[PDB]
Homo-oligomer: A and B are copies of this chain.
Amino acid sequence: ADPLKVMISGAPASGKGTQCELIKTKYQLAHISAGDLLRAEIAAGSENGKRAKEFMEKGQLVPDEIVVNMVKERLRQPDAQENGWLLDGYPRSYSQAMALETLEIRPDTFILLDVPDELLVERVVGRRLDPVTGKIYHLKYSPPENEEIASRLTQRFDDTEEKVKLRLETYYQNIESLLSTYENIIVKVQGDATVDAVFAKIDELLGSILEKKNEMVSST
């Protein structure tokens, strides 16, 4: 509808979660995230959680019945319809993408983070997470702000160096169908650069899209 609606995706450890924080904090959008929702169910320890976890341990995609409608109902909440939605890690397969088209849910732009596979490994092996806040960190690039935060940092069960090669396969194998799907409003953004350097680009993009929509609104 008229509120801004974005959709982001990319290979694992490219900067999806990191960028979304910046976008969210400024634009005030409702940040949805297929990855986080999955982990939340696991955290709660439900049957869906202990089911989903299995696929995530082998680097597999969690089956549609869990994901598709879990996302569905999050979009039904008011904030997403009034302020705007920001998808993250969805869709990830033809069927998933198609599910949304049948409900007339199409974004304004599709941002893909392009990162060379050679980089990824070291990005993930140093990634940390502060549970009390939710802020992403990295021991070298973007380290903790020398606070007690350093003592409360943790890591995901699936950030094993060798897991990466596996999660890469599932990735590019499926994105071929995605690009095909009416998502051709794809804006490829180079990820091999400063966290600030990348954001600036995504900001400028969203900024102009606001002008476009607003121009028609001001039909004089």
Binding site for B on A (CB under 8 A): 43-46, 49, 57-59, 128, 131, 150-160, 162-163, 166
Contact = CB atoms under 8 A, between A and B. Distances in A.
B59 A151 contact: yes
A155 B157 contact: yes
A125 B162 CA distance: 14
Given A45-B43, A45-B45, A57-B131, A160 B153 contact: yes
A164 B49 CA distance: 29
Identical copies in the complex = 2
Q: Tell me whether chain A's interface is mostly helix, strand or loop, or mixed.
A: loop
Contacts of A156: 157
A199 B131 CA distance: 38
Contacts of A162: 150, 153
Contact of A166 (B46, B131, B151): B151
In order of increasing CB-CB distance, the 6 nearest A-B pairs are A45-B45, A154-B157, A44-B45, A57-B152, A58-B151, A58-B152
B160 A155 contact: yes
Nearest to A165: B151
Contacts of A131: 57
A166 B49 CA distance: 31
22 contacts: A43-B45, A44-B45, A45-B45, A45-B46, A45-B49, A57-B131, A57-B152, A57-B154, A58-B151, A58-B152, A59-B151, A150-B162, A151-B163, A151-B166, A153-B160, A153-B162, A154-B157, A154-B160, A155-B155, A155-B159, A156-B157, A157-B157
